[PDB]
From Swiss-Prot, chain A:
Gene3D superfamilies: 60S ribosomal protein L36. It comes from Saccharomyces cerevisiae (strain ATCC 204508 / S288c). Coiled coil: none annotated. InterPro entries: Ribosomal_eL36, Ribosomal_eL36_sf. Component of the large ribosomal subunit (LSU). Mature yeast ribosomes consist of a small (40S) and a large (60S) subunit. The 40S small subunit contains 1 molecule of ribosomal RNA (18S rRNA) and 33 different proteins (encoded by 57 genes). The large 60S subunit contains 3 rRNA molecules (25S, 5.8S and 5S rRNA) and 46 different proteins (encoded by 81 genes). Component of the ribosome, a large ribonucleoprotein complex responsible for the synthesis of proteins in the cell. The small ribosomal subunit (SSU) binds messenger RNAs (mRNAs) and translates the encoded message by selecting cognate aminoacyl-transfer RNA (tRNA) molecules. The large subunit (LSU) contains the ribosomal catalytic site termed the peptidyl transferase center (PTC), which catalyzes the formation of peptide bonds, thereby polymerizing the amino acids delivered by tRNAs into a polypeptide chain. Present with 31600 molecules/cell in log phase SD medium. There are 2 genes for eL36 in yeast. PROSITE patterns: RIBOSOMAL_L36E. One of its GO terms (molecular function) is structural constituent of ribosome. The gene is RPL36A. This is Large ribosomal subunit protein eL36A. One of its GO terms (cellular component) is cytosolic large ribosomal subunit.
Swiss-Prot record, chain B:
InterPro entries: eL8/uL1-like, Ribosomal_uL1, Ribosomal_uL1-like, Ribosomal_uL1/biogenesis, Ribosomal_uL1_3-a/b-sand, Ribosomal_uL1_CS. Pfam families: Ribosomal_L1. One of its GO terms (biological process) is cytoplasmic translation. This is Large ribosomal subunit protein uL1A. One of its GO terms (molecular function) is structural constituent of ribosome. Disulfide bonds: none annotated. One of its GO terms (cellular component) is cytosol. Its main location: cytoplasm. The modification Phosphoserine is found at S79, S86. It is found in: Cytoplasm. It comes from the Eukaryota. The gene is RPL1A. Keywords: Acetylation, Cytoplasm, Methylation, Phosphoprotein, Ribonucleoprotein, Ribosomal protein. Belongs to the universal ribosomal protein uL1 family.
Swiss-Prot record, chain C:
Component of the ribosome, a large ribonucleoprotein complex responsible for the synthesis of proteins in the cell. The small ribosomal subunit (SSU) binds messenger RNAs (mRNAs) and translates the encoded message by selecting cognate aminoacyl-transfer RNA (tRNA) molecules. The large subunit (LSU) contains the ribosomal catalytic site termed the peptidyl transferase center (PTC), which catalyzes the formation of peptide bonds, thereby polymerizing the amino acids delivered by tRNAs into a polypeptide chain. This is Large ribosomal subunit protein eL15A. There are 2 genes for eL15 in yeast. It comes from Saccharomyces cerevisiae (strain ATCC 204508 / S288c) (Baker's yeast). The keyword Zinc-finger does not apply.
UniProtKB/Swiss-Prot annotation, chain D:
The modification Phosphothreonine is found at T2. Component of the ribosome, a large ribonucleoprotein complex responsible for the synthesis of proteins in the cell. The small ribosomal subunit (SSU) binds messenger RNAs (mRNAs) and translates the encoded message by selecting cognate aminoacyl-transfer RNA (tRNA) molecules. The large subunit (LSU) contains the ribosomal catalytic site termed the peptidyl transferase center (PTC), which catalyzes the formation of peptide bonds, thereby polymerizing the amino acids delivered by tRNAs into a polypeptide chain. Component of the large ribosomal subunit (LSU). Mature yeast ribosomes consist of a small (40S) and a large (60S) subunit. The 40S small subunit contains 1 molecule of ribosomal RNA (18S rRNA) and 33 different proteins (encoded by 57 genes). The large 60S subunit contains 3 rRNA molecules (25S, 5.8S and 5S rRNA) and 46 different proteins (encoded by 81 genes). It is found in: Cytoplasm. This is Large ribosomal subunit protein eL13A. Present with 133000 molecules/cell in log phase SD medium. There are 2 genes for eL13 in yeast. Transmembrane segments: none annotated. It comes from Saccharomyces cerevisiae (strain ATCC 204508 / S288c) (Baker's yeast). Belongs to the eukaryotic ribosomal protein eL13 family. The lineage of its organism: Eukaryota, Fungi, Dikarya, Ascomycota, Saccharomycotina. It comes from the Eukaryota.
């Protein structure tokens, strides 16, 4: 940051000599991990795609990433996860039924 | 044989796979030194501005010899002889017109560019014709010959929307090689128009002449 | 460990393998009695993270509860008052099915203490739960510094006072602006905010 | 403590007032002027 030192405007506020604290591990609560990558990958190829996930990749190959999202968005909760879900599908498609 | 060494599914990082670097030194089977080359799938559009064109200067050469013919006028001809094979006047266009084309590429002056225009029908097809776009005309002609001989490399987007250039020889060392791909990607990645959509670097691949290819992230 | 694979597997309920399983298992329960003792967790990873342990004193119970809305009892739908109160049929029930499930097993095993419960299956008629319980008189539990808390009398019929994890949910017990109404407890917070407080020296 | 009872007066002349007015302002048109930078960078 660095604050202007006045009480309006862009970096509004008091100039204090700053510190920057040690990072909290909760804050790394989402993070991957080698153990989880492995098990999720394994489980995936064990248990294989689910109905909506099949309708999803054919929708891609046959209609584009935009019809895919629009539907994935209804199927899942939201637009954002729909994005993530299509991307994942893409990466199934590519990594597999290609190279 | 060559196929087994590569992994199609794996996407390696620049050092791990040769790309330009170590593993493909094994891949390139041929008796002669092969060039290693770089290939992109670029999301880019039909629009002219959205095309990707500029010239990167490889830190370490292509290590191929390129014979220039360069046509210039005045103190610029004199300047030419310093770092150039075959100094040419405005008169010389008639000789190249008749038949002689013993030169890899051509570089010209702004002054020259009127005279140049006659040359273009013969030149344009091989894409030898000088253009600001592939920096072949500049009045700082002396510096620029130095760059092309050092091994400044040319980049042209296709209509196909793949972008391509040769980065080095396979034989050159791994460390050397990595520097060149890096400059080239860095140069690509900047040239990229704002007007282009999501992920400018769609795919990245390098290959040798003969061999299979491995993809880079 | 195998528990981490179990965990991830169970998150693929629509996968070919889990619905084979889901389908066979769900017919099996619907045959058995509405409340029946379970021999062992059918989800030993789920049980174990909700506090289950494989020792004497820990009991698993399986239970079925009917799905759907709460029909408002009332003779012939007659409501006898204002029209805002005339509904009988879109009326929903403030507790969850899991809570009914806990409560009915809890009364079936008055001597046990409900510890927790997890969902295991449904069809269109029932939701099925496995309920994890503890014997607070088994010495294995009465010793044990990690569990003996359950042995105390404030923990009688936790399931019945909305103090199991489901109870705390529906009671709306969370920190936040989203929980103002129901949080220090609803009825209690109303009472506070509707008490007239007069000092000796009137303020 | 944050300062001292008395101390030299230094006036470089810049209104304080007007410093605020202008500071208020830069923040106001900040996004707008960034949209003119986007729309003018685009210029073919």
């Amino acid at each position: 940051t660095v604050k202007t030192g006045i009480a309006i405007g862009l970096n509004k506020g008091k100039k204090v000599t700053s510190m920057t604290p040690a990072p909290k591990i909760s804050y790394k609560k989402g993070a991957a991990s080698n153990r989880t990558k492995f098990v999720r990958s394994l489980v995936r190829e064990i248990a294989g795609l689910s109905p909506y996930e099949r309708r999803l990749i054919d929708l891609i190959r046959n209609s584009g990433e935009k019809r895919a999202r629009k539907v994935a968005k209804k199927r899942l909760g939201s637009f954002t996860r729909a994005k993530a879900k299509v991307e994942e599908m893409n990466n199934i498609i590519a990594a597999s039924r290609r190279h | 044989m060559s196929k087994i060494t590569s992994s199609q599914v794996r996407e390696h990082v620049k050092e791990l796979l040769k790309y330009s670097n170590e593993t493909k030194k094994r891949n390139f089977l041929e008796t002669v030194e092969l060039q290693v080359g770089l290939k992109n799938y670029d999301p880019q559009r039909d629009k002219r501005f959205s095309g990707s064109l500029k010239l990167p200067n490889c830190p370490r050469p292509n290590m191929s010899i390129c014979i220039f013919g360069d046509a210039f006028d005045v103190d610029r001809a004199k300047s030419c002889g310093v770092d150039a094979m075959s100094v040419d006047d405005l008169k010389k266009l008639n000789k190249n017109k008749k038949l002689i084309k013993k030169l890899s590429k051509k570089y010209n002056a702004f002054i020259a560019s009127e005279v140049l225009i006659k040359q273009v029908p013969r030149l344009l097809g091989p894409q030898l014709s000088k253009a600001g776009k592939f920096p072949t005309p500049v009045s700082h002609n002396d510096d620029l010959y130095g760059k092309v001989t050092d091994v400044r490399s040319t980049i042209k987007f296709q209509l196909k929307k793949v972008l391509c250039l040769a980065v080095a020889v396979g034989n050159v060392e791994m460390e050397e090689d990595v520097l060149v791909n890096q400059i080239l990607m860095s140069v690509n990645f900047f040239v990229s128009l704002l007007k282009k959509n999501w992920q400018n670097v769609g795919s990245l691949v390098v290959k040798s002449s003969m061999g299979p290819a491995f993809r880079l992230y | 460990g195998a528990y981490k694979y179990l965990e991830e597997l169970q998150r693929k309920k629509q996968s070919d393998v889990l619905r084979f399983l889901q389908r066979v298992r769900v017919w099996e329960y619907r045959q058995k009695n509405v409340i029946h003792r379970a021999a062992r967790p059918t989800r030993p990873d789920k049980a174990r993270r909700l506090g289950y342990k494989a020792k004497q004193g820990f009991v698993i119970y399986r239970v079925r509860v009917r799905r759907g809305n709460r029909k408002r009892p009332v003779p012939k739908g007659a409501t006898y008052g204002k029209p805002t109160n005339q509904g009988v049929n879109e009326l929903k029930y403030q507790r969850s099915l899991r809570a009914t499930a806990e409560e009915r097993v809890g009364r079936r095993a008055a001597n046990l203490r409900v510890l927790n419960s997890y969902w295991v299956n449904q069809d269109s008629t029932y939701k099925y739960f496995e309920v994890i319980l503890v014997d607070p008189q088994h010495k294995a539990i009465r010793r044990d510094a990690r569990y003996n808390w359950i042995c105390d009398p404030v923990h009688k019929h936790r399931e019945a006072r909305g103090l199991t994890a489901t109870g705390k949910k529906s009671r709306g017990i969370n920190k936040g602006h989203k929980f103002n109404n129901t949080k220090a407890g609803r009825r209690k917070t109303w009472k506070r905010q509707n008490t007239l407080s007069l000092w000796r020296y009137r303020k | 403590a944050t300062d001292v009872e008395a101390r030299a007066v230094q006036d470089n002349g810049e209104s304080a007032f007007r410093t605020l007015r202008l500071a208020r302002s830069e923040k106001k048109f900040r996004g707008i002027r960034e949209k003119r930078a986007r729309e003018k960078a685009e210029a073919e």
